[PDB]
Design a protein around this ligand. Structure first.
Ligand SMILES: *[C@@H]1O[C@H](CO)[C@@H](O[C@@H]2O[C@H](CO)[C@@H](O[C@@H]3O[C@H](CO[C@H]4O[C@H](CO[C@H]5O[C@H](CO)[C@@H](O)[C@H](O)[C@@H]5O)[C@@H](O)[C@H](O[C@H]5O[C@H](CO)[C@@H](O)[C@H](O)[C@@H]5O)[C@@H]4O)[C@@H](O)[C@H](O[C@H]4O[C@H](CO)[C@@H](O)[C@H](O)[C@@H]4O)[C@@H]3O)[C@H](O)[C@H]2NC(C)=O)[C@H](O)[C@H]1NC(C)=O
Ligand SMILES: *[C@@H]1O[C@H](CO)[C@@H](O[C@@H]2O[C@H](CO)[C@@H](O[C@@H]3O[C@H](CO)[C@@H](O)[C@H](O[C@H]4O[C@H](CO)[C@@H](O)[C@H](O)[C@@H]4O)[C@@H]3O)[C@H](O)[C@H]2NC(C)=O)[C@H](O)[C@H]1NC(C)=O
Ligand SMILES: *[C@@H]1O[C@H](CO)[C@@H](O[C@@H]2O[C@H](CO)[C@@H](O[C@@H]3O[C@H](CO)[C@@H](O)[C@H](O)[C@@H]3O)[C@H](O)[C@H]2NC(C)=O)[C@H](O)[C@H]1NC(C)=O
Ligand SMILES: *[C@@H]1O[C@H](CO)[C@@H](O[C@@H]2O[C@H](CO)[C@@H](O[C@@H]3O[C@H](CO)[C@@H](O)[C@H](O)[C@@H]3O)[C@H](O)[C@H]2NC(C)=O)[C@H](O)[C@H]1NC(C)=O
Ligand SMILES: *[C@@H]1O[C@H](CO)[C@@H](O[C@@H]2O[C@H](CO)[C@@H](O[C@@H]3O[C@H](CO)[C@@H](O)[C@H](O)[C@@H]3O)[C@H](O)[C@H]2NC(C)=O)[C@H](O)[C@H]1NC(C)=O
Ligand SMILES: *[C@@H]1O[C@H](CO)[C@@H](O[C@@H]2O[C@H](CO)[C@@H](O[C@@H]3O[C@H](CO)[C@@H](O)[C@H](O)[C@@H]3O)[C@H](O)[C@H]2NC(C)=O)[C@H](O)[C@H]1NC(C)=O
Ligand SMILES: *[C@@H]1O[C@H](CO)[C@@H](O[C@@H]2O[C@H](CO)[C@@H](O)[C@H](O)[C@H]2NC(C)=O)[C@H](O)[C@H]1NC(C)=O
Ligand SMILES: *[C@@H]1O[C@H](CO)[C@@H](O[C@@H]2O[C@H](CO)[C@@H](O)[C@H](O)[C@H]2NC(C)=O)[C@H](O)[C@H]1NC(C)=O
Ligand SMILES: *[C@@H]1O[C@H](CO)[C@@H](O[C@@H]2O[C@H](CO)[C@@H](O)[C@H](O)[C@H]2NC(C)=O)[C@H](O)[C@H]1NC(C)=O
Ligand SMILES: *[C@@H]1O[C@H](CO)[C@@H](O[C@@H]2O[C@H](CO)[C@@H](O)[C@H](O)[C@H]2NC(C)=O)[C@H](O)[C@H]1NC(C)=O
Ligand code: NAG
Ligand code: CA
Ligand code: CA
Ligand code: CA
Ligand code: CA
Ligand code: CA
Ligand code: CA
Ligand code: CA
Lengths: 120, 112, 377, 533
């Protein structure tokens, strides 16, 4: 129960663009803020960005490593979250995890992230 | 912005205790943090606990009660009481702030 | 100035035997019952009264008990006071009567857990507590000691949320309910038995209760109704109502709470404190030691003086010990059949619009008085 | 003296609502200026909520002084997600019925904080009835309204924060930081609990009832020997540390073996700086607290109320006659013992249930103070006493006594149970005062009159010279020589005015014209109204 499932991980050249998708199930997706967290292939976690719900005007947040390059979007009718990635660097190689904040600002649920392999 | 400082490694004999530390920025010494356990082979992180400035904590739904937390000014601690083989992991500190989230560099816990 | 002693009926002789035991109205302990004083400008006028502790003045005892769960083993030991205390008091007086009532707390949202489960049983599910109540008058004062054992032996313990308990609006009802409690014109003893601190006025504000206690009887079917409507009394309102209704309080309280009740004793006049055993197993000797402390001291009250009038006291006691000022109201070590003297000085600073007024000087804990009538020259 | 007591403006709310339980000034300034009044027991247009409480906006300058309720909240009680998902049927998570909303009202600039200290909830895990607090914070003139419920947490029963009653007391600091008291945390130890309006706004996550205000200050839990203390029964703010950031005064009326104490907590941290302790056991020391500079030394002086205090009469009878304790701040610190004490004269009157600064009411150079006695006066309706500022601290005897103009009734009025002063409603340049009187469902507004300073002399001729702060250009005087009697207009900017032809005696003319605001001037103290040769 309470699953998150990432899709769209692939091997791509630098300077390209890629679309990552996440599907939620077993909880009311329109009542949680959802978030992206990367982990490069031998390194600690890094927060990528996130996206609030309708009462918070669907406001969206991004790390300075990611601002202007990536964009996050939501479809509460599809229980689904998206990351659009543009002008990819070799630094963008990671597992990308999809996750949810609680009111006490901890990540309660995590998916099992898609590998992105930005390489020539 | 918020900086979270962790030591790269900690260790104890099977059945002894371990204490991890995460230190907040001095501007942010009263902030509440989450603890994650995440070292299990290529698996996603797991929420362990959240921990307040005053030392108050709340554990995740499945956590073995060996885990407990405490605070001292800017420092935050995770204590594991009697290390099992299943406690061998990376542990990540993490803090929400006005415009995002930040994670500590992680601590590996090792049996010896 | 001049004075005239009008009544002057003598204090009792030491009683000769059982052949004609006196009524509590026939026993006399204070010497001049009425006198008239002619006051003249700034001239001080002095008179003297004698006091003599009577041999066998009757007792009424009301036992007021905290029935929160920690008093469960206390209640199991308290079942037998209605014969054991009747026996140990039979050397103390010919006439003794006993009564019982019980308290917990105000039945409103901060002081009680208000879920449907905790309204039915205030305790953990293995503890069979009855639902909470503010006060019960279980047994109005009686000489039938086995009726105390019967009714007290069939009470059931209750429970509560916050540590200090709602005992002060149970003390107020015991003082002001008079003929419902059954009090005579005798020595009125109230035993207040508990293992916690007291709620007092201003604690009602957390429950949205803002009307002060009016200090009037609100019993229906022996239950205190309206505990949800009036705040707890202040100590200053209990000081008034206990003193006005002749009630002498024994705080029979556990070893932990001695330092609060030892100061409540300093505020509430003619009251005493004992160290209660965890299971109230020492109750009979606690009450008797406290009664000997309450009974062997006199304090002189007076009614309100009119404008520009002044009063002062000197006291002469056993073994040559004396006192003056506000300590001149007191006297101590008064043994059974023993005698005491006071000298009292009235003074004026004015000539009031009326030629006279009068006021009573009286021992706290008794209905006996001297009336002083003032004539202004 | 200076407050217009013969015809104050009276506001009235619904019968049996407790209108006037808490009062305040809103937008004090040249425009938009209004009175806010709380009504804890009022009915409300919320689905299924009984006596939820209300707050009323009462705009100033409208001659009938009408009042309209503000919808901070407009929803019913929320429902348990499991229950609305279940064949067993729906149940509430919340108990908004009888919550006492509007029992505390505060404002700072365009922001308003209104609190419901008898709110309670079922914790979403297990059946509980926990009286946590709630407040609603309005920002930018009702542009946004935010629920702030800082004790509503995963620490949910009487042993944690479950009985906290946050917003039982509240303040705003000079920068606009929200400060709350909750007397019930950790088995009634109590708590102080503070956040900025920017943190309260950044925290907003309305789908979560347990939520984090990241960076919030709060006082820790202590050992069980501190239980039943009631910290935060009352709060006030002033600068006491010697830094730029105001420090929280808080009342602990049951602390210290029931003697009671008051604590000053520092701003920036929340650590304790000074402690003062009550004179007598179960005198309610810390029922009220206030901080203002009453001697004009530049430093905030502390005031504390103990409404239940006893003394005994010169006769020897005891009486309940409350006491107010004053502690001047020196540049070296605050003394641990009172520099002055004021005591009431009516038995059960409860002098010191209410304290407010008045600002400088009479523009004398020194801040005055109003003190309430909710059961004082010859028929126990209640009283308010104005005590003057001066170089030694407050005067020991009041410069004015305010009392109800309406007759007594079947239940108490509680007049003077709530006070707010030291802002200016009509804009005449003198402070004004609001008095609450919730037992009759009323609030009363008293206005500072303009003050004239005057002088005259005999010169056998006689001369007159008068002037005053914010007074009109021509001042109406009337004069008697002892006979000859005259009425004169003396210009406020003049050096002197004089007449050719014993004693000379003068007054402001009683029938002179009423000023632009609707008031008449008061003649100042001293000022020698009679001269004799
Ligand atoms: C104005 O008046 C008030 C009183 O009215 C006065 O305040 C009291 O002041 C005293 C003295 O400062 C306080 O008592 C001290 O409290 C200290 C804190 O106690 C709590 O925290 C302790 C430390 O653990 C927490 O904090 C550390 C931070 O470093 C953190 O790592 C931990 O994870 C944790 O978060 C803790 O040990 C302590 O434990 C007690 O309470 C818990 C319940 O919370 C209980 O389970 C324990 O059994 C125990 O009773 C508590 O949790 C404390 O550190 C300090 O310790 C001293 O005394 C002990 C002996 O008693 C010594 O062994 C030790 O070496 C220290 O000397 C001490 O107990 C008291 O709490 C205040 N009361 C309040 C706030 O209500 C103000 O100071 C006055 N202001 C003035 C005078 O200006
Ligand atoms: C800050 O917020 C407060 C609260 O909303 C606000 O006070 C209110 O302002 C409105 C708008 O001026 C007032 O509404 C008026 O109500 C009276 C009757 O009580 C009407 O007669 C007024 O009619 C005028 O405005 C109408 C607008 O539809 C016109 O159609 C009409 O022809 C008139 O021009 C008007 O509706 C309301 O009474 C006050 N409430 C109180 C109690 O003050 C305040 O104005 C805001 N301040 C800002 C925005 O800075
Ligand atoms: C109420 O409290 C009192 C005092 O705490 C209890 O008194 C105690 O009674 C017990 C009996 O259960 C006594 O124990 C016995 O002592 C003898 C002699 O030492 C020993 O041979 C027995 O094996 C037994 O242990 C005990 O001495 C006595 N005193 C205390 C303080 O323990 C009393 O039992 C409690 N209950 C009631 C209903 O009174
Ligand atoms: C305290 O007050 C009492 C009462 O006023 C004082 O008693 C007085 O004691 C003196 C000395 O004994 C008495 O004078 C003599 O008394 C004996 C009998 O005690 C008598 O035989 C002598 O002829 C002579 O009267 C005095 O009368 C007595 N007064 C009274 C009214 O009892 C006592 O001295 C005072 N002590 C203190 C504390 O100063
Ligand atoms: C909020 O609304 C409630 C409910 O309408 C009001 O309570 C109601 O108060 C009235 C008038 O006193 C009650 O009616 C009276 O009943 C008594 C007998 O109980 C009778 O003697 C009178 O003839 C009379 O009609 C009524 O029962 C009561 N209803 C409820 C549901 O409590 C309340 O006054 C309102 N409060 C505010 C602040 O407006
Ligand atoms: C009320 O709380 C404030 C904030 O904690 C107190 O001011 C604080 O005072 C300490 C000690 O002076 C300051 O520590 C500083 O450390 C830096 C180096 O990191 C040093 O250069 C400074 O000279 C000082 O030692 C702390 O920064 C300062 N915090 C603030 C916000 O100013 C204040 O002392 C407390 N109230 C009082 C006066 O007791
Ligand atoms: C708690 O005590 C009460 C009172 O004894 C119990 O209720 C009584 O139960 C007995 C035996 O079933 C009946 O004969 C009485 O008529 C009942 N009286 C009442 C109070 O209704 C109750 O059953 C007990 N509960 C527990 C937890 O044992
Ligand atoms: C106890 O004493 C009081 C006071 O003397 C008695 O109350 C008075 O009783 C008489 C006769 O009924 C009345 O005329 C007075 O008006 C009463 N005064 C008071 C104080 O109310 C009371 O009757 C006596 N009771 C007993 C048991 O003797
Ligand atoms: C709590 O209150 C008691 C009583 O006022 C305080 O004890 C007093 O201490 C002061 C200063 O030493 C003395 O002047 C008083 O005479 C003492 N009174 C009593 C009754 O002993 C006690 O210090 C207070 N504790 C706190 C909170 O400071
Ligand atoms: C100047 O003095 C006279 C004498 O006091 C005042 O006239 C009386 O004032 C008193 C008090 O206001 C009134 O009760 C009398 O009715 C007045 N009439 C007299 C003469 O007895 C007069 O008001 C004073 N006026 C000025 C200008 O100061
Ligand atoms: C009473 O008098 C006796 C001597 O007869 C003395 O031992 C005892 O202490 C006195 N009691 C007091 C002080 O009341
Ligand atoms: Ca108890
Ligand atoms: Ca017991
Ligand atoms: Ca209780
Ligand atoms: Ca400061
Ligand atoms: Ca000052
Ligand atoms: Ca002034
Ligand atoms: Ca004004």
């Amino acid at each position: 129960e309470v699953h998150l499932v990432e899709s769209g991980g692939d091997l791509v050249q630098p300077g390209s663009s890629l679309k990552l998708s996440c599907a939620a199930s077993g909880f009311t997706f329109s009542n949680r803020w959802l978030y992206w967290v990367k982990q490069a292939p031998g390194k600690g976690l890094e927060w990528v960005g996130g996206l609030k719900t309708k009462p918070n005007l669907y406001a969206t947040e991004y790390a300075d490593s990611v601002k202007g390059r990536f964009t996050i979007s939501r479809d509460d009718s599809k229980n689904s979250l998206y990351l659009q990635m543009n002008t990819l660097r070799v630094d963008d190689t990671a597992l990308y995890y999809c996750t949810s904040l609680t009111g006490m600002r901890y990540f309660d649920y995590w998916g099992q992230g898609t590998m992105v392999t930005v390489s020539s | 912005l918020d900086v979270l400082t962790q030591s790269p490694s900690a260790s104890a004999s099977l059945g002894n205790s371990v204490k991890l530390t995460c230190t907040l920025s001095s501007q942010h010494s009263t902030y509440t943090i989450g603890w994650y356990q995440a070292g299990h082979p290529d698996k996603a992180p797991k929420y362990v606990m959240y921990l307040n400035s005053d030392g108050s904590h709340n554990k995740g739904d499945g956590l073995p009660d060996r885990f407990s937390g405490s605070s001292s000014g800017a420092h935050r601690y995770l204590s594991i009481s009697n290390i099992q083989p299943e406690d061998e992991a990376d542990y990540f500190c993490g803090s929400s702030y006005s415009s995002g989230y930040v994670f500590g560099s992680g601590t590996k816990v090792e049996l010896k | 100035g001049s004075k005239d002693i009008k009544k002057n009926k003598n204090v009792t002789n030491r009683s000769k035997g059982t052949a004609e035991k006196l009524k509590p109205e026939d026993i006399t302990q204070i010497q001049p019952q009425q006198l008239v004083l002619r006051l003249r400008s700034g001239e001080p006028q002095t008179f003297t009264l004698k006091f003599k502790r009577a041999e066998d003045y009757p007792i009424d005892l009301y036992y007021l008990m905290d029935l929160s769960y920690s008093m469960k083993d206390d209640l199991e030991n308290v079942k037998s006071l209605g014969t054991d205390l009747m026996n140990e008091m039979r050397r103390i007086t010919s006439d003794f009567r006993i009564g019982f009532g019980s308290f917990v707390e105000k039945t409103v949202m901060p002081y009680i857990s208000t879920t449907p489960a905790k309204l039915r049983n205030p305790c953990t599910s293995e503890q069979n507590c009855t639902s909470p109540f503010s006060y019960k008058n279980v047994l109005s004062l009686t000489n039938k000691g086995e009726v105390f054992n019967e009714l007290v032996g069939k009470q059931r313990i209750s429970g509560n949320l916050d540590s200090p308990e709602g005992g002060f609006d149970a003390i107020m009802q015991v003082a002001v309910c008079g003929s419902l409690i059954g009090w005579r014109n005798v020595t009125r003893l109230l035993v207040f038995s508990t293992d916690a601190g007291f709620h007092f006025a201003g604690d009602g504000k957390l429950g949205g209760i803002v009307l002060p206690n009016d200090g009037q009887c609100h019993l229906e079917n022996n239950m205190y109704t309206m505990s949800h409507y009036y705040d707890y009394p202040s100590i200053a309102h209990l000081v008034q109502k206990l003193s006005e209704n002749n009630i002498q309080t024994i705080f029979a309280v556990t070893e932990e709470f001695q330092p609060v009740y030892k100061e409540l004793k300093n505020l509430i006049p003619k009251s005493a404190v004992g160290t209660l055993s965890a299971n109230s197993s020492n109750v009979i000797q606690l009450i008797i030691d406290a009664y000997n402390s309450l009974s062997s001291e006199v304090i002189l009250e007076n009614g309100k003086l009119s404008e520009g009038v002044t009063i002062s006291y000197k006291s002469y006691c056993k073994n040559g010990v004396n006192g003056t000022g506000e300590n001149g109201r007191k006297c101590s070590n008064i043994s059974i059949g023993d005698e005491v003297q006071f000298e009292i000085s009235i003074t004026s600073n004015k000539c009031p619009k009326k030629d006279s007024d009068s006021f009573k000087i009286r021992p706290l804990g008794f209905t006996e008085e001297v009336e002083v009538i003032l004539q202004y020259i | 003296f200076n407050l217009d007591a013969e015809a104050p403006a009276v506001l009235s709310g619904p019968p049996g609502s407790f209108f006037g339980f808490s009062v305040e000034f809103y937008r004090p300034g040249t425009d938009g200026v209004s009175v806010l009044v709380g009504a804890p027991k009022a009915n409300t247009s919320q689905p299924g909520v009984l006596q939820g409480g209300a707050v009323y906006l009462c705009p100033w300058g409208a001659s009938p002084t009408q009042c309209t309720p503000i919808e901070f909240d407009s929803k019913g009680s929320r429902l348990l997600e499991s229950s609305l998902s279940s064949s067993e049927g729906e149940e509430p998570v919340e108990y908004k019925s009888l919550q006492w909303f509007g029992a505390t009202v505060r404002a700072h600039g365009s922001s308003i904080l209104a609190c419901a200290p008898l709110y309670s909830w079922r914790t979403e895990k297990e059946p509980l009835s926990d009286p946590v607090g709630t407040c609603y914070l309005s920002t930018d003139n009702f542009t946004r309204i935010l629920e702030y419920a800082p004790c509503r947490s995963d620490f949910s029963w009487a042993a944690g924060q479950g009985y906290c009653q946050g917003g039982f007391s509240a303040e705003f600091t000079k920068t606009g930081r929200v400060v709350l008291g909750g007397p019930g945390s950790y088995f009634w130890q109590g708590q102080i609990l503070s956040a900025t309006q920017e943190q309260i706004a950044e925290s907003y996550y309305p789908e979560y009832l347990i939520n984090l205000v990241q960076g919030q200050l709060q006082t820790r839990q202590a050992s069980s020997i501190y239980d039943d203390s009631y910290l935060g029964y009352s709060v006030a703010v002033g600068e006491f540390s010697g830094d730029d950031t105001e420090d929280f005064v808080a009342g602990v009326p049951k602390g210290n073996l029931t003697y009671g104490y008051v604590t000053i907590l520092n701003g920036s941290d929340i650590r304790s700086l000074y402690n003062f302790s009550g004179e007598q056991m179960a005198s309610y020391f810390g029922y009220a607290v206030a901080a203002t500079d009453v001697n004009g030394d530049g430093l905030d002086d502390l005031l504390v109320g103990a409404p239940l205090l006893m003394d005994r009469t010169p006769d020897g009878r005891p009486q309940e006659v409350g006491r107010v304790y004053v502690y001047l701040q020196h540049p070296a610190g605050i003394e641990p013992t009172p520099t002055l004490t004021l005591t009431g004269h009516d038995e059960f009157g409860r002098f010191g249930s209410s304290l407010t600064p008045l600002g400088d009411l009479d523009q004398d150079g020194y801040n005055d103070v109003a003190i309430g006695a909710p059961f004082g006066g010859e028929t126990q309706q209640g009283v308010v006493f104005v005590f003057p500022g001066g170089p030694g601290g407050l005067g020991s005897k009041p410069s004015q006594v305010l009392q109800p103009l309406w007759a007594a009734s079947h239940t108490p009025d509680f007049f003077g149970s709530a006070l707010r002063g030291g802002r200016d409603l009509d804009g005449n340049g003198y402070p004004d005062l609001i008095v609450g009187s919730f037992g009759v469902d009323k609030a009363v507004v008293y206005r500072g009159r303009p003050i004239v300073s005057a002088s005259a002399s005999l010169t056998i001729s006689f001369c007159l010279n008068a002037s005053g702060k914010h007074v009109a250009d021509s001042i109406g005087f009337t004069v008697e020589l002892q006979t000859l009697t005259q009425t004169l207009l003396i210009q406020n900017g003049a050096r002197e005015d004089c007449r050719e032809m014993i004693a000379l005696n003068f007054s402001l003319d009683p029938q002179a014209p009423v000023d632009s605001h609707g008031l008449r001037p008061a003649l100042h103290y001293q000022s020698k109204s009679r001269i004799e040769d």
